[PDB]
C-alpha cells in the first residue's frame, strides 16, 4: 500500500505542462504514482480539492550554508514551499575556512565563530548528521578559498596559492559539492584575475559541477561582466549560470533588453543559466558603492550601532553630516537593502523563458529583505495569478523542473512515478507573499503542506519536527 495519497487536486508536474486532475501517491521516499489512484490501497487518502499538486521549490540561489545547521527548521524556507536549497553562492561559502572574524561579505552567513571547518567534507558530514528540513545541494565559494589561502587578498593569486585553492576546491567537489560560485564584485574577491578564477575552477569538467557567478558589475559594465562570464564558461567547458540578474542604478534602468539579448545569443553556443528574485531592491554586505547607494537604501543590522538596524541610511548619513558614501566606514561591518533596479526590468527578467526562480535570502539579518520569507509564492501569486506574466505551469516549472535539470538534480524537480516525493500542496487563487519590507518575516498565504523526500515537513502553518532533508549531489 501507499504511505498516503494526495487526492482530488491539480497536478502542475514541473514540466511546464497545464495542470490536470489526478492524485499523487507515496510510498517512503517516492511518488510511487500519479493519476486516478482510486484503486490503490492507501494508508492515507488526504483532500486535497481545490488545491495544486506540484514538486517541491528549489531556491536556486541561497546563502543557506549555516543556516541549514543552526535552524534546522529552515522555516523561512519551508513555509513558501522550498524542499531544496542550492548554497555557496556568489563566492560565498561556510565551508572550507576556519576564521574568527572572517571579511565580508563572509559576515552574512556568521552567526559567531560559525567558520568552524577546515574542510568542506567536515562542514557535509555536520549536515548529514543533523540534517535540515530541506535538502542541500552545496557549493564551495572563490572567496572563501581565498580567504583560506592569501595572506594579502588585495592582489592576484600566484600559482602557489592558485594550487592551494584549486587542491581545496578539488577536495570540496570530490566530497560532494556539486560546484564552484565566485563574486569578483566584492572585496575578497575584487582583485582576482579572470586566469586566477578559471585555474581554481578547471577540476569542475573532471567532477561534472558547475560553475555559478555573482558577475563583476551588474551596472555600467555589466557587458564586460557577461562576456568574461562566457568566457569563463567557453575555458572551464562546463554549465554557467549567472546570479541575480539585474541591471542596478537609473543609468542602466531599462537595459535588460540588452543583458537578456547577450545571455540568449551565448545560450546557443554555450551552457548558460541565470536566476533571479522577483523584487527591485538587493541587499547584501553595507559597502562603499556609488550606485548602490544612490537610491534608498536600509540597514539590517550593524555591529558597531546595533541600533541602527532598520533605519533608513539617508537619515542616518544626513544626521552624521554626510552622505550615505561618506559614511559607510563608519558603520561597518553593516548589511543593508539597497532600492536600486526598476520594475520592468525585473519583470522582464523573470518572464524572460530561462530564468530560474532563486530567493537570494539573508537569513541571518535582523531586519531582512522579505524576499527571505516571500519570494517563491511572490511568483505564484503576483507575478502568475495577478499579472499575468506567466501561466501558472511555466512559474512552477522555473521553480521547479528548470532547476533541477540545470544544476543537476537527479530525480527531483517533477511529479513522476519514481521521483523524490519532494511536493508542495498549494491553494492557486490565495498563495501569496505575506511578507514586506516593513514586516519582511511574515509566513506566505496559501501554502497548505510541503513533503520532503516524502515525509510532510510544513503542515498547519508549522514546522513539522521532520528533519527530512539530505544532502544532495550532482
Ligand atoms: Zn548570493
Ligand atoms: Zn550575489
Not at 140 to 163: F, K, Y
Not at 464 to 474: C, F, I, P
Request: one cysteine or more; proline letters at 6%; hydrophobic letters at 40%.
Amino acid at each position: 500500500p501507499f504511505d498516503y495519497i494526495l487526492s482530488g487536486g491539480t497536478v502542475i508536474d514541473g514540466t511546464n505542462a497545464p495542470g490536470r486532475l489526478a492524485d499523487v501517491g507515496v510510498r517512503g521516499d517516492r511518488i510511487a504514482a500519479v493519476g486516478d489512484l482510486s484503486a490503490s490501497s492507501a494508508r492515507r487518502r488526504i483532500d486535497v480539492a481545490g488545491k495544486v499538486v506540484s514538486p517541491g521549490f528549489i531556491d536556486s540561489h541561497t546563502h543557506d550554508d549555516n543556516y541549514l545547521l543552526k535552524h534546522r527548521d529552515m522555516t523561512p524556507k519551508i513555509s513558501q514551499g522550498v524542499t531544496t536549497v542550492v548554497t555557496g553562492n556568489c563566492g560565498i561559502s561556510l565551508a572550507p575556512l576556519a576564521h574568527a572574524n572572517p571579511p565580508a561579505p563572509l559576515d552574512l552567513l556568521d552567526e559567531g565563530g560559525s567558520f568552524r571547518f577546515a574542510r568542506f567534507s567536515d562542514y557535509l558530514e555536520a549536515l548529514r548528521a543533523a540534517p535540515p528540513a530541506v535538502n542541500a545541494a552545496c557549493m564551495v565559494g572563490h572567496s572563501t578559498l581565498r580567504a583560506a589561502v592569501m595572506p594579502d587578498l588585495r592582489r592576484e593569486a600566484t600559482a602557489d596559492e592558485i594550487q592551494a585553492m584549486q587542491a581545496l576546491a578539488d577536495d570540496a567537489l570530490a566530497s560532494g559539492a556539486i560546484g564552484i560560485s565566485t563574486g569578483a564584485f566584492y572585496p575578497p574577491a575584487a582583485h582576482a584575475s579572470t586566469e586566477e578564477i578559471i585555474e581554481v575552477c578547471r577540476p569542475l569538467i573532471t567532477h561534472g559541477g558547475v560553475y555559478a557567478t555573482h558577475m563583476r558589475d551588474e551596472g555600467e559594465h555589466i557587458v564586460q561582466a557577461l562576456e568574461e562570464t562566457f568566457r569563463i564558461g567557453r575555458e572551464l567547458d562546463v554549465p554557467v549560470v549567472i546570479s541575480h540578474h539585474k541591471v542596478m542604478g537609473k543609468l542602466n534602468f531599462g537595459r535588460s533588453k540588452e543583458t537578456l539579448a547577450l545571455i540568449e545569443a551565448a545560450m546557443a553556443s554555450q551552457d548558460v543559466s541565470l536566476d533571479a528574485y522577483p523584487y527591485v531592491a538587493g541587499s547584501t554586505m553595507l559597502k562603499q558603492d556609488r550606485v548602490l547607494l544612490a537610491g534608498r537604501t536600509l540597514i539590517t543590522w550593524c555591529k558597531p550601532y546595533p541600533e541602527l538596524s532598520g533605519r533608513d541610511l539617508e537619515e542616518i548619513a544626513a544626521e552624521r553630516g554626510k552622505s550615505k558614501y561618506d559614511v559607510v566606514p563608519e558603520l561597518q561591518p553593516a548589511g543593508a537593502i539597497y532600492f536600486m533596479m526598476d520594475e520592468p526590468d525585473v519583470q522582464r527578467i523573470l518572464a524572460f523563458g530561462p530564468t530560474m526562480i532563486g530567493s537570494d535570502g539573508l537569513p541571518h539579518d535582523e531586519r531582512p529583505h522579505p524576499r527571505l520569507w516571500g519570494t517563491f509564492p511572490r511568483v505564484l501569486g503576483h507575478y502568475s495569478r495577478d499579472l499575468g506574466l506567466f501561466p501558472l505551469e511555466t512559474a512552477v516549472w522555473k521553480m521547479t523542473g528548470l532547476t533541477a535539470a540545470k544544476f543537476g538534480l537527479a530525480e527531483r524537480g517533477q511529479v513522476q512515478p519514481g521521483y523524490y516525493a519532494d511536493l508542495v500542496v498549494f491553494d492557486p487563487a490565495t498563495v501569496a507573499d505575506s511578507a514586506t519590507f516593513e514586516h519582511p518575516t511574515e509566513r506566505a498565504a496559501g501554502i497548505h503542506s510541503v513533503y520532503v523526500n516524502g515525509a510532510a515537513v510544513w503542515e498547519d502553518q508549522s514546522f513539522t519536527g521532520q528533519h527530512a532533508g539530505r544532502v544532495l549531489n550532482r
